Amino acid sequence: TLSEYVQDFLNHLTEQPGSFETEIEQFAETLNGCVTTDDALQELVELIYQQATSIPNFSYMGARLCNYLSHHLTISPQSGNFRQLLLQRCRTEYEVKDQAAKGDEVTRKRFHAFVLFLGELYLNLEIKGTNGQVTRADILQVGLRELLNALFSNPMDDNLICAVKLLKLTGSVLEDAWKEKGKMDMEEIIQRIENVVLDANCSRDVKQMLLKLVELR
């Protein structure tokens, strides 16, 4: 089945991160021969999306794999390409982020995996722009800002640690994009972080991590 093939390959990348470069072409090639329906494309997207948002430490690999397949799969069905379906799928979970940042620490591990997968996707998913230049996904730029708002609004240590990671990852790229468009988001994020540090009952070391970000941005 497609799902056995894909899941085997994802397990393989998880166990052997080094094998991406030498096995990715064969993976794309095999998928090109077998992913021929809108349905099969949708299922491929779902399997990779699940691995990236479950499975710890699959953020970077997930996003790198997503970008690769978005450029190397030849199927372009009427209803959406890989890129397009992925981005749609991300909006689905992103819609429940206000609730996802509550719950309990174990349930939130999946939310954090989703947040960082989206951060890595934003950095690494290359889209040919309207002017033919490489651009980043807009819906991800917007989603990241809202995810940060959700994480700071529920200032439990593990939520704050997730926000710190996401901003170390994407913060300079975000800062640049907001400034090109004369937006004040980084200022607003900085005030949110300062209010956490002033008010929240989180750990001292997490507060100190937040303060280091205020120096840099």
Curated annotation (Swiss-Prot):
It comes from the Eukaryota. Interacts with the RRM1-RRM2 and C-terminus regions of PABPC1 in a 1:1 stoichiometry. Interacts with EIF4A. It is found in: Cytoplasm. Residues 3-217 form the MIF4G domain. Residues 1-217 are annotated as: PAIP1 middle domain (PAIP1M). Only the PABPC1-interacting motif-1 (PAM1) stimulates translation initiation. The chain holds residues 157 to 373 of 479 of the full protein. Acts as a coactivator in the regulation of translation initiation of poly(A)-containing mRNAs. Its stimulatory activity on translation is mediated via its action on PABPC1. Competes with PAIP2 for binding to PABPC1. Its association with EIF4A and PABPC1 may potentiate contacts between mRNA termini. May also be involved in translationally coupled mRNA turnover. Implicated with other RNA-binding proteins in the cytoplasmic deadenylation/translational and decay interplay of the FOS mRNA mediated by the major coding-region determinant of instability (mCRD) domain. This is Polyadenylate-binding protein-interacting protein 1. The gene is PAIP1.
